[PDB]
């Protein structure tokens with residue numbers, strides 16, 4: 001039965017302490033940087049948060065523990081200051097949205113109102129006014145999508161539209177055995193909401209990758225590998241948080257269930273998977289359609305793949321610099337995380 005399978009996992013992982021190596025070391029060629037105006041933008045974000053129709057205590061818990069302006073600052077360390085507000089706001093949207101919707105009918109209603117908002121704002125007849133009904137996490141999305149679209153070409157807008165629809169519908173669609181690990185991992189590859197952040201590098205850096213390059217197999221592979229990398233490192237980094245509220249559909253635990261690995265072996269398996277996909281990602285760059293003549297085009301290709309890589313390294317770097325997933329005291333002097341599956 002479900003309970004039996006979930007029972008044994010809780011028993012097998014409970015109170016386990018697992019020291020995790022510094023994940024950024026597994027991606028050595030990809031550096032972590034910080035946008036230089038994070039503090040100043042956070043002042044603006046704090047004032048803006050006062051008007052978001054989310055509960056004060058909830059907005060402050062997100063700001064205090066997740067501090068998504070910092071995540072935007074690591075994803076987009078070289079953007080100009082004026083781009084940082086909309087990037088940070090979007091990240092507060094997606095984490096607030098995910099939180100409120102984390103009841104079948106409520107999820108169905110909100111997803112449809114959110115898809116409506118996405119179409120309203122990014123589609124062929126733009127309407128940025130929220131309907132009078134709108135719940136807080138939908139009402140706040142209209143000005144965010146409007147501001148992003150103002151800095152995007154219609155080519156990038158179409159990609160952001162489809163990527164946001166994919167994320168929304170992945171959440172709606174996900175509602176006797178724990179799931180198979182590959183099934184879970186592949187589900188997160190399809191549904192995880194990292195791809196709108198790759199596209200927002202085009203807002204952040206004020207460029208458009210041509211679609212013929214975006215559809216090239218090497219670019220498609222770099223986007224995919226970086227999506228897989230972000231997910232994999234998140235499986236490890238979020239394990240303590242997820243296990244503490246007994247959300248056992250965590251890749252590490254699914255490896256424990258399906259293959260009877262220890263929690264130590266399972267985490268080591270995910271780390272191996274990160275090394276494989278990083279090496280695959282690195283190989284794809286030589287296959288990209290680099291121009292022999294066009295400096296601007298090659299700077300755009302460069303920037304776009306750096307956006308992809310910073311999603312992987314930046315997600316890690318941010319997790320090591322906030323308390324969304326663990327207490328920062330759990331990191332030692334060389335940034336090894338001591339997971340604690342106590343509860």
Ligand SMILES: CC(C)=CCC/C(C)=C/CC/C(C)=C/CSP(=O)(O)OP(=O)(O)O
Nearest residue numbers: 094095098193194197230231234238242315
């Ligand atoms: C960390 C990561 C993969 C991405 C950060 C940047 C973006 C755009 C993430 C997608 C949005 C959400 C809700 C991620 C939560 S996965 P979780 O493990 O942090 O939260 P959960 O434990 O599933 O509630």
Ligand SMILES: [Mg+2]
Nearest residue numbers: 234235238242
């Ligand atoms: Mg997770």
